[PDB]
From a paper:
Sirtuins are NAD+-dependent protein lysine deacylases that sense the cellular nutrient status, regulate energy metabolism and stress responses, and have been implicated in aging processes and aging-related diseases. Sirtuins feature differing substrate acyl selectivities. Here, we analyse modulation of [name] and other isoforms by quercetin and its derivatives in activity and binding assays and through crystal structure analyses of modulator complexes of [name] and Sirt2. Our results hence reveal sites and mechanisms for Sirtuin modulation by quercetin derivatives and provide helpful insights for [name] modulator development.
To identify [name]’s quercetin binding site and interaction details, we determined a crystal structure of a [name]/ADP-ribose/quercetin complex at 1.84 Å resolution. Well-defined electron density for the quercetin ligand revealed the distal end of [name]’s extended acyl binding channel as binding site. The catechol moiety of quercetin (ring B) is buried in a protein pocket and its 4’-hydroxyl group forms a hydrogen bond to the Pro62 backbone oxygen, and the 4′- and 3'-hydroxyls form water-mediated interactions with the backbone of Ala53 and Ile61 and the side chain of Asp116. Asp116 normally forms a hydrogen bond to the NAM moiety of NAD+ bound in the so-called “C-site”, illustrating that catechol pocket and C-site partly overlap. The quercetin chromen-4-one system contributes to complex formation through hydrophobic contacts with funnel surface patches formed by Phe64/82/86 and Val70/115, and Met136/157. Comparison of the [name]/quercetin complex with a [name] complex with the pyrrolo[1,2-a]quinoxaline-based activator UBCS039 shows that they share most of their binding sites. The catechol group of quercetin overlays well with the UBCS039 pyridine moiety and reproduces its key interaction to Pro6217. The chromen-4-one substitutes for the hydrophobic pyrrolo[1,2-a]quinoxalines of UBCS039-related compounds, which can vary between UBCS039 derivatives due to the non-directed nature of its interactions and the wide and hydrophobic architecture of the [name] funnel. It thus appears that the buried catechol group of quercetin functions as an anchor in [name] binding, while the chromen-4-one provides smaller and non-specific binding contributions and might be particularly amenable for modifications to increase compound affinity. Since quercetin occupies the distal end of the extended [name] acyl channel it is compatible with binding of acetylated substrates but would overlap with longer substrate acylations such as myristoylations. Thus, quercetin stimulates the deacetylation activity of [name] and inhibits [name]-dependent demyristoylations, as observed for UBCS039 and consistent with their binding to the remote end of the [name] acyl channel.
Residue numbers in the entry: 10 to 169, 177 to 298
Write the structure that this text describes.
């Protein structure tokens, strides 16, 4: 834990100049239009624009620690709002353009945005989620569960059980929840398009799931300000802020980014909404 390898921290950021950024986001649109099964992979980069620092960015938690400085939070977890990127992903699922969403984020924003939990793998856990050690029932709380490392929180299960509730935050030693990783793995293998957003892809095996898409000739898009572990495997690398990339993508797809109603939990995806007809792609 104290000597846990925190990987490559504080690499220089890359900014695609505007003409190139505009051309890459057009190519991403073309890829989304052409794909049968689109899977998104998110990391801490999608939450930096809500005030939650990442881990390995220039002011990330691990980067600052290396330099003997502290990360800065501009929000609590409870007062953090979903970004434009978070809400774009909600809409993409609703119109059937996203098959599944794999996140390394513990910040609870995908759940709180109203993204359906049955299309989400939360590989590293959720700050707001406790789980019955007996029956495995999960409770999505309105405040952060005050423990980390799969510890007893002190609350008990209420299923019609009295099982001990534990946090879902993996420590360095803990392996990924089997359900989340198994669904994330099946989605990534069966996808013909994996898109990574604000992850450096340094964690194994979370960071490696997008590569599974390349099996049977799937395509891989990496959107990130820094270099990533798997840059050389990407069909398309977009170096720009994920909110800029996603608002431009949504405009190309003719989709609006929906309103956030405040924190709301959706267990099961709703029936798909209508979406714009597809352009002719030669
Ligand atoms: N607004 C932004 N737009 C685009 N890219 C961004 C933005 N902000 C940050 N980035 C990029 O976002 C990337 C975020 O990379 P990392 O900080 O490694 O986070 P992870 O989610 O992959 O960390 C994985 C696990 O490691 C930890 O131990 C935990 O257990 C994590 O769950 C950077 O490369 C930024 O350049
Ligand atoms: O529990 C914690 C936590 O999860 C995170 C964290 C950091 C960056 C992220 O991008 C993120 O999603 C979470 O930081 C912390 C920093 C502390 O001083 C104390 C904590 O207890 C946490
Ligand atoms: Zn129980």
């Amino acid at each position: 834990p104290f000597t846990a390898d925190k990987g490559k921290c504080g690499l220089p950021e890359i900014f695609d100049p505007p003409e190139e950024l505009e051309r890459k986001v057009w190519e991403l649109a073309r890829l989304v239009w052409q794909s049968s099964s689109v899977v998104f992979h998110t990391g801490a980069g999608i939450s930096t624009a809500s005030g939650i620092p990442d881990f390995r960015g220039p002011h990330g938690v691990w980067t600052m620690e290396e330099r003997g400085l502290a990360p800065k939070f501009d929000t609590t977890f409870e007062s953090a709002r979903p970004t434009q990127t978070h809400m774009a992903l909600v809409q993409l699922e609703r119109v059937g353009l996203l098959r599944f969403l794999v996140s390394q984020n513990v910040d609870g924003l995908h759940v709180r945005s109203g993204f359906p939990r049955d299309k989400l793998a939360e590989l590293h856990g959720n700050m707001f989620v406790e789980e019955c050690a007996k029956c495995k029932t999960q409770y999505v709380r309105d405040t952060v569960v005050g423990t980390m490392g799969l510890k007893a929180t002190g609350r008990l299960c209420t299923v019609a059980c009295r099982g001990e509730l534990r946090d879902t935050i993996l420590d360095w030693e803990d392996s990924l929840p089997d359900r989340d990783l198994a669904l994330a793995d099946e989605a990534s293998r069966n996808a013909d398009l994996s898109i990574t957003l604000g992850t450096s892809l340094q964690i194994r095996p979370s960071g490696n799931l997008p590569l599974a898409t390349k099996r049977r000739g799937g395509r891989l898009v990496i959107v990130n300000l820094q270099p990533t572990k798997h840059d050389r495997h990407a069909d398309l690398r977009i170096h720009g802020y994920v909110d800029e990339v996603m608002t431009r993508l949504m405009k190309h797809l003719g989709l609006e980014i929906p309103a956030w109603d405040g924190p709301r939990v959706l267990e099961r995806a709703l029936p798909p909404l209508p979406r714009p007809p597809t352009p002719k792609l030669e």
